[PDB]
Amino acid sequence: RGKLIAVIGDEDTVTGFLLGGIGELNKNRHPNFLVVEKDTTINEIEDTFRQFLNRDDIGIILINQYIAEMVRHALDAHQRSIPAVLEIPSKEHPYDAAKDSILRRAKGMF
Amino acid sequence: IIETKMLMGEVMREAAFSLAEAKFTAGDFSTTVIQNVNKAQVKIRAKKDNVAGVTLPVFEHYHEGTDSYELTGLARGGEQLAKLKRNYAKAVELLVELA
Amino acid sequence: MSFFPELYFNVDNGYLEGLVRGLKAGVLSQADYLNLVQCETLEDLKLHLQSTDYGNFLANEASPLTVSVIDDKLKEKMVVEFRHMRNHAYEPLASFLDFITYSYMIDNVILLITGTLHQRSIAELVPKCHPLGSFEQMEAVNIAQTPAELYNAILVDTPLAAFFQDCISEQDLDEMNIEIIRNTLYKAYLESFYKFCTLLGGTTADAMCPILEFEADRRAFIITINSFGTELSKEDRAKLFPHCGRLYPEGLAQLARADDYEQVKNVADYYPEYKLLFEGAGSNPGDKTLEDRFFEHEVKLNKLAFLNQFHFGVFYAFVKLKEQECRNIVWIAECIAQRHRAKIDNYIPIF
Numbered sequence: 001r002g003k004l005i006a007v008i009g010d011e012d013t014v015t016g017f018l019l020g021g022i023g024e025l026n027k028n029r030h031p032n033f034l035v036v037e038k039d040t041t042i043n044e045i046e047d048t049f050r051q052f053l054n055r056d057d058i059g060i061i062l063i064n065q066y067i068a069e070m071v072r073h074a075l076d077a078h079q080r081s082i083p084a085v086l087e088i089p090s091k092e093h094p095y096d097a098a099k100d101s102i103l104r105r106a107k108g109m110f
Numbered sequence: 111i112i113e114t115k116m117l118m119g120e121v122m123r124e125a126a127f128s129l130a131e132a133k134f135t136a137g138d139f140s141t142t143v144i145q146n147v148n149k150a151q152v153k154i155r156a157k158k159d160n161v162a163g164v165t166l167p168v169f170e171h172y173h174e175g176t177d178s179y180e181l182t183g184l185a186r187g188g189e190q191l192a193k194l195k196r197n198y199a200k201a202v203e204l205l206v207e208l209a
Numbered sequence: 210m211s212f213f214p215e216l217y218f219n220v221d222n223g224y225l226e227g228l229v230r231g232l233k234a235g236v237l238s239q240a241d242y243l244n245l246v247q248c249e250t251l252e253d254l255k256l257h258l259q260s261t262d263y264g265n266f267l268a269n270e271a272s273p274l275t276v277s278v279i280d281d282k283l284k285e286k287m288v289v290e291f292r293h294m295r296n297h298a299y300e301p302l303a304s305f306l307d308f309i310t311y312s313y314m315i316d317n318v319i320l321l322i323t324g325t326l327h328q329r330s331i332a333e334l335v336p337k338c339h340p341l342g343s344f345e346q347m348e349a350v351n352i353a354q355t356p357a358e359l360y361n362a363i364l365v366d367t368p369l370a371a372f373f374q375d376c377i378s379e380q381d382l383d384e385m386n387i388e389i390i391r392n393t394l395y396k397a398y399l400e401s402f403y404k405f406c407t408l409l410g411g412t413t414a415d416a417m418c419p420i421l422e423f424e425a426d427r428r429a430f431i432i433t434i435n436s437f438g439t440e441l442s443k444e445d446r447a448k449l450f451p452h453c454g455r456l457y458p459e460g461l462a463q464l465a466r467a468d469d470y471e472q473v474k475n476v477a478d479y480y481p482e483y484k485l486l487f488e489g490a491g492s493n494p495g496d497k498t499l500e501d502r503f504f505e506h507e508v509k510l511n512k513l514a515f516l517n518q519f520h521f522g523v524f525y526a527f528v529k530l531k532e533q534e535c536r537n538i539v540w541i542a543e544c545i546a547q548r549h550r551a552k553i554d555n556y557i558p559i560f
Contacts, residue, residue, distance in 0.1 A: 001172075003154045005206070015143050016125055019191070020198035021151030021178055031147060059154050060169065060209040082167065084209050088118070091126045091546060095119035097112065127547040134540060134556075135500055141320060141337045145327070146387075180439045183391040186428065188435035189500060 003059035006052060007033040013064060013090060026057070036067055046074045053083055060084045066093040076101040111208075118204055125197040132194050135187030142181060149176045152202060171206050214411055215519060221299040228294060229523050233515070235262050237534055239558050246553055250274070251545050258538070276542040283535035288340045291528060301409070305521050307368070308402045309528060310341055314369055315398060317342025319391045321349075322363070322382075325356040356383075372397045385445075392432075392449045399424060403453040412520040420510045420526075425454030426483065427503045433464050433473055434499070455480060482506070501557070508533070508557055533559055 004024055007017045014035055017023070024032050034048055049071060052058055061084070068075055068087050075085065089095040097103055132139070155170040178195055182188055210216075219226070237245075241261065248254040251274040255267045266286065271278045295306040317338050324334060331350040346366035352358035360379040364370050376397040382390055403421045406414050429450045436446065443465045450461050460476075467473040477483045486506055490499035497505075511529060514522040537556050544553050 001153065001155045003156060004150060005152070005154055005202075011140055011144075012126070012129055015140055016129055016194070016198045017202065018143055018147065019178070019195050020202045021174075022202065023147050024150040025147060035144070059156070060206070062205065086205065086209050088205070089122055091123075094123070095115060097115070123547070127543075127549045130543040130547050130549070131552070133543065134536065135504075138316075138337075138339065145320075145323070180388060180441075182432065182435050182439075183388060183395070186431040186435070186503075187500060188431075189498060192438075 003057060004032055005060050005062065006058045007062045008036065008049070008052070008067060009033070009062065009064050009088075010036045010067065010090065013088070017062065032058075036064075042071060046071055049074060053078055058083060060086060062086055062088055064088055064090045064093065065096060065099065066090060069099060072101075076104070114204070114208060118201070118208060121197075121201050121204060125194065125201050128190075128194045128197045132187070132190040135190050136181075136184035139181065139184045139191075142184065146179055146181075148179075150174060151176050151178055152199075154206070169206050169209060171203050210411060218519060222302070225294060225297055225302065226518075226523070228297075229527055230518075232262065233523075233527060233530075236530065236559060237261060237537075238560050242537075242554075242558050245541055248541065248545055251276075251279075251542060254541060254545060263538070276539065276546050279542050280535070280539045283538060285340070287531045287535060291341075291531075294524070302521060302524060304405070305524060308398070308405070309525055311369060311372075311398055311402075313339050314342035314344070314367065315394045316391065317344070318363065318367060318369065318394070319387060322359060322390075323387060325352075325354045325359050328354050330354075369394075369398075372401065389445055389449070396428075396449055396451050399428075399451050400453050403451075406521075409521070412517050413522060416514045416517055416520050417522045417525065420507070420514065420522075422454045423503075423506060423510060425451035426456060426480070427507075429454065429456055429461065429464055430473060430477060430483075431500075431503070433467060434470065437468075437470070504557055508559070512560065530559060533557070 005022050007014060007022055009017065014033055018033070022033075026032065034045075036045075052061060059082070063075075063085065065087055067090075078085070085101075087095075087100055103109075151174055153172040153174045155172045157168050157170050159166050159168040180188075181191065184191075241257070244257050245254060248257065251267075259265055259268075263283070263286075266282050267279065270282070291306070295303070295310075298306055320338060321331060321334055321344075324331060331352075335350070344367050348362050349366050352362055357379065360377075360382075364373055367373070372394065376394055377390070399421060403418060403425075406417055406421070432446055432449055446465060447461065450464070451457075456464070460479075463476045464473065467476045474487050477487050486502040487499065489497065489502045489505075492498050511526040514520065514526045515530075537558070540556050541553070544550060
């Protein structure tokens with residue numbers, strides 16, 4: 001209806017999810033996703049993550065597993081249900097349950 | 111949740127090597143797609159879920175209606191792009207369920 | 210020429226002929242694919258490929274195992290090698306290699322255009338620009354992002370102005386999507402190259418013109434086939450069908466009326482080679498598809514061109530041969546990364 005899924009991913013996953021229909025340019029004419037290449041810094045990535053968090057029109061986010069590891073403290077600094085944040089694997093980093101903030105909230109449930 | 115997450119991982123790998131095979135017939139489609147970004151065909155229709163005395167929001171998978179775009183010029187490899195579209199669509203369905 | 214070729218042909222073709230032929234001797238065959246299929250890891254792929262023209266191309270660079278850098282390095286070496294080769298060229302072969310350069314300048318122009326609509330600096334698109342479309346001319350970059358300045362500066366700069374004086378018009382570009390623009394440019398270029406080759410009649414024409422005729426016919430089929438799932442009008446389909454194929458005197462009207470896939474099969478049944486190709490398309494999990502059959506026939510005609518030696522197709526078919534070598538190398542790499550060994554040999558080898 002009004003909220004749009006957003007993707008912070010490397011080039012291949014980003015093409016994959018743009019191909020699945022995920023993607024918009026808002027009235028402000030900006031992408032609702034970010035491209036991750038080899039040459040990026042954790043600090044501006046964290047500021048863009050904050051741009052995502054504070055913006056109201058997202059709901060759910062989709063971040064790779066090593067990309068989510070690269071920003072782990074800032075990622076886990078947020079605890080609110082409405083901005084859902086979900087982790088996905090990648091080609092070279094299959095899924096890892098031991099590395100996940102929400103499954104860390106479920107402490108001792110193993 | 112762990113089971114559905116394992117299904118998620120293997121389905122993502124399905125989409126991943128489908129992309130790997132789409133890297134073959136077409137070529138350098140990546141920037142062509144990344145530039146062509148106008149509107150979304152998939153949207154979140156937020157619903158509610160009265161699981162108990164407390165209500166928790168949930169979501170629904172929406173096909174908005176503006177079809178997925180058509181790139182027929184990348185050296186004529188549209189079939190692989192279509193099956194890749196199908197793969198990532200199914201993946202995104204399962205992912206909204208997980209969300 | 211005039212029923213007595215090779216009078217003084219080899220005067221200005223010696224060293225380039227020798228270079229291309231020597232590299233042709235070093236082309237990977239299925240024998241090398243027999244030891245490049247049993248890799249299971251990119252390190253052994255590098256070990257095996259050290260015995261090829263690709264000497265140590267991953268040693269002392271990209272220590273962790275990757276796939277993207279393999280593709281990039283292959284493209285860089287191969288493109289720079291044909292820059293060297295074209296740089297040892299002479300005027301006829303220089304026109305040939307300029308047209309082979311145009312085959313990439315088309316998609317490089319396509320990448321570099323409509324950046325005005327998104328209001329982006331061209332220097333941000335230069336990194337992703339494929340090297341074989343350099344457009345080494347002033348004032349292409351940072352034109353105030355106005356489409357009119359782009360159109361005029363591209364007319365001034367890009368040597369594709371010969372095509373653009375009768376292929377593009379800025380106003381019409383705004384209405385049609387880029388999908389039509391790329392394909393009309395490539396139709397114009399294909400026709401121009403076909404005619405130019407025809408003027409230089411000989412082995413060159415008889416060997417490469419059937420390749421371009423197959424290009425035109427496969428194009429005419431695929432445009433219809435993959436335009437079942439779209440609302441493109443038949444008008445653009447007609448504007449996108451080349452007029453230098455087997456189907457130009459008549460046959461184009463049939464591919465406007467073959468709405469279902471089986472109808473396109475029936476139309477293609479009249480051309481027996483293409484009937485065999487369509488009869489080879491199974492589209493089933495375990496066999497090849499129609500695109501694979503078109504690619505196989507393309508490879509076959511490239512081999513038939515390679516049979517001859519006194520032709521300008523030694524310098525184009527070999528370029529595509531190197532493309533497919535690099536492409537299969539990236540395929541083996543992608544099968545190593547994804548562990549999808551069920552399709553380790555699901556590609557088209559070379560000889």
